[PDB]
Symmetry: D2
Subunit: 274 residues, 4 copies
């Protein structure tokens, strides 16, 4: 297998290819004057199985660039193309939340199904979206790498899921830290934050309103050191400043989405799925 | 048939639907906080044949937005979807100009072929790109509307094609103005600009280097009033200022690509192809 | 005086320089790889009084590009620089609408005051913002050019201001069309739309919610042909589609802000203010 | 003193305020529908001396946002405002490299001089640009934090400055690693890479052409483990992929400019300058 760097995951692709003990296939990427995307496989591709690693922070650009990379790889032989999209755009469009809406991830699933043979992503908004794929849909989990990152800096804490739906993440981290978990329902459904360190984990932190709320509250409940983590740190606008004011000790996310707090890497999570 | 407005051609769609004596189907379009595209068909769709009019100035956004609109229309019935993309992005990637390059328009042609039943565009960079489509590929011509726009403001001129490859456009306009045509090869292959009004037409004006050159020269040859026209006025950066300095009297383009000189509309050119 | 083209008003600058019977001073503009702005005065500047015409659709880019152009012009002699900013960004920040907010136009007024000797803009959100300038603050009005555009296509109509604060524009247009004016307060404070053509004018159409409302209502009141006009057609997202569905016959704006309906030019309005 | 977070340095501001044992002043930042910037100081400001930390990756946005934050802080009391701009945009425009060009950093220096009382930046392209400021112009150095980062992972290496002008950085790092330094002039002016680990440091890595070259060469000269570092990792386009192919073992930059390799923080470098 050869590893192809997408434009948006050049360092993750490198880390992955390093773990796989492979040389990174040089791939040229540029924008024409009008801004159109240009991809070209510089190195020679003997192997006929390629792995494309390109996250989708810039949703549309990533989608079109992937469509073009596939065309260039097929045209170079490669019988099997595996697409690694750490952050998969449009996954929040599970269903028709209103009449006339378009189920985005479904439409794109159809396209991915005709251009790549396998799709691997990290912590999708919803795993049921696999039903839309006529190809293998793999999803790894980074919560554990997050749990490990903070296990070092939290004195016997309690894991908390901002909302009941994030409970699974809380539990997972809970296991790796040997702590107790629970979720907010506003106050924790069971446990009490009084005088304890807290580790709040969720899959995404977008505007930061969900966490800001949990953080502010937990502090008012007498919690001590609090660290907020998430797989995809979208952190829009002043999200970070929002959490920092709320009192968090630190905010930490992975490199599935570039942010000022993408301290944890999913490189290994990806390698084990290949 | 119903006319669906893409986000990038809202006024052209209106003009077209007006000519077709149809009501414009209200279509909701917005961006989520993270910038993902959101489309929703607000009005009810009884008819089962829709026409999508969305040019691609923002190449990637237009492509993904089209992919989502189709998904929403199929999901609403509509057995036949005709996509009108006045300006078709990635059409300059005709072939592999180097080993390892991706034939962009080919890859996207494959996608258009699986999501729409027919594709109509105005003055593609190359018409041979139809070979890539497993569906009807129609291409109209706006040169005539351009010729008509200036016939009014040029005292017995001569039509000129910047390069030999733009000759066809020159001739076409030439016919509608009853003037003589020719092309630059640097000087006009035959005719002479001395003391005459000149109408230079080409399909695209990107950086403006091609025209700036023709204009500067023709002026040095004693040409009088010069008007530069093109179907797609990409006009990147200081392109316009470049031509104005060169001495053009006016620059005029159509509405297939929004610019400060999109004075001519292709609405009717489109209607006749439907 | 010499006319300097900003990057965002290249065609307006040309039209203005044409009316002033002057040659447009060639100005180079480009972006470095990292996207920083680069300006260079290509032609020689003997005259010591320059006029910069650069609207601010891309607010921040326009502000910094203006800051750099001034530096280049002073460095070339030019004792007096007049800045023409058809659309003046940040003008909606009149005052502190909340404790801790920044009065944007005030901060920028201070900057304009130290880099240009005179500022001319078309239809500011609020004219009181002149108090913030330690230099001459001129503001022209395009409503008349708008009134003239439609006088040709509306059978004895009535001018309407969407809100009481847009009354002034309604009246102005009212005068040039000899029709009666009035404003919505929801229904017209006096006149009745029943069986009449309507011309609704306002200074800005952003999301389109204000007009969409007026249009829908007036139609329900039995109005006939309706045309919506505005000086600055910001028309965000699906604004146009919104108005078209509401039933407007046409939407028309000026070239102070590039849109698909910038059919009217303020070139002359500007020339008379110089 | 209070620490104000700019939108582009929210995490660095937090780290700095943490080191300063101060609470981060909550600052609201958002974009209106048309994209204009909106800033509001949410918390109360008793102290009359503020420190603004906002790097300029998005050059123009950062400049205007700073102009607005100052206006809001003065309006809140604050007699002294210190601006920390880790990465200072437009610093490469030292002088007029051509007739008619604008000395960008000079024009902006004038503005910074009238809105802030002190300016602190990390590793400017040129320090002579201080001549343009009528206020205190401080510049810290991150090379040492970079040297420290790699001292841990390089077996007795040699520090190399890509070009003679980056020599100073090489020497600095050289001191902290006790290794020998030198520069490329193509080959190293003195030392030889044969069988040795190499640490190449420069202030900026933009397109990556400078380093890619050094790396490729040094490898051809038999160098072993090579690590490339820089203060500002602009890393445009495929820059990283370019270096990785060239053979670098790792690329590392600071958080003055967000990138996928901003592993080293300048928080402390900044704190010591306050
Ligand atoms: N990229 C996005 N950002 C924010 N909201 C989204 C996005 N994509 C879809 N949505 C909406 O988010 C809501 C998600 O509901 P849920 O999955 O239950 O959290 C629906 O109203 C979706 O239309
Ligand atoms: N969007 C674009 N802008 C500029 N050049 C392009 C674009 N798409 C492709 N090209 C290149 O333009 C050249 C076109 O050659 P031709 O079609 O003969 O004019 C080839 O080197 C293409 O790779
Ligand atoms: N560019 C903008 N777009 C939308 N709203 C804005 C903009 N600039 C300021 N505002 C806000 O618009 C409101 C305008 O009130 P008014 O001037 O009475 O219409 C205040 O809450 C301002 O903060
Ligand atoms: N942001 C930038 N990116 C790339 N080049 C720039 C930038 N700003 C200025 N320049 C140009 O870079 C060259 C720098 O020369 P030097 O400072 O000797 O490396 C001059 O021709 C400048 O006009
Ligand atoms: O179930 C979990 C929710 O989807 C996330 O908590 C939510 O998407 C995060 O959004 P925000 O940070 O803007 O509150
Ligand atoms: O054959 C015609 C050429 O393709 C066009 O003249 C060319 O694409 C226009 O480009 P520019 O205005 O940047 O010179
Ligand atoms: O007084 C007039 C109002 O300021 C305008 O009607 C308003 O700003 C237009 O905004 P929108 O088109 O988003 O409703
Ligand atoms: O003196 C040092 C040079 O300014 C830098 O080496 C240069 O600016 C880096 O540019 P690039 O990575 O695009 O070669």
């Amino acid at each position: 297998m050869i590893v192809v760097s997408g434009s948006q995951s050049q360092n993750l692709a490198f880390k992955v290819a390093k773990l796989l003990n492979t040389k990174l296939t040089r791939v040229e990427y540029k924008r024409f004057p009008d801004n159109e995307i240009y991809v070209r496989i510089v190195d020679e591709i003997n192997d006929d199985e390629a792995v494309i690693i390109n996250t989708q922070k810039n949703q549309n650009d990533a989608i079109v660039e992937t469509i073009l990379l596939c065309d260039a790889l097929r045209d170079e032989g490669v019988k099997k193309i595996t697409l690694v999209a750490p952050y998969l755009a449009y996954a929040r469009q599970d269903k028709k939340f209103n009449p006339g809406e378009a189920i985005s991830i479904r439409a794109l699933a159809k396209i991915y199904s005709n251009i790549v043979d396998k799709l691997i992503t990290i912590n999708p908004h919803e795993t049921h979206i696999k039903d839309f794929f006529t190809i293998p849909f793999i999803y790894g989990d980074a919560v554990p790498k997050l749990a490990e990152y903070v296990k070092d800096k939290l004195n016997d804490p309690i894991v908390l899921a901002p909302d009941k739906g994030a409970l699974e993440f809380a539990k997972t981290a809970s296991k790796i830290l040997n702590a107790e978990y629970d979720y907010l329902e506003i106050a924790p459904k069971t446990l009490d934050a009084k005088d304890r360190d807290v580790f709040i984990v969720d899959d995404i932190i977008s505007t930061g309103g969900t966490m800001a709320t949990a953080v502010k509250l937990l502090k008012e409940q007498g919690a001590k050191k609090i660290i907020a983590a998430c797989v995809h740190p979208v952190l829009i606008g002043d999200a970070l400043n929002k959490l920092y004011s709320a009192g968090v000790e630190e905010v930490v996310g992975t490199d599935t989405y570039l942010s000022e707090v993408s301290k944890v890497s999913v490189a290994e999570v990806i390698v084990d799925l290949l």
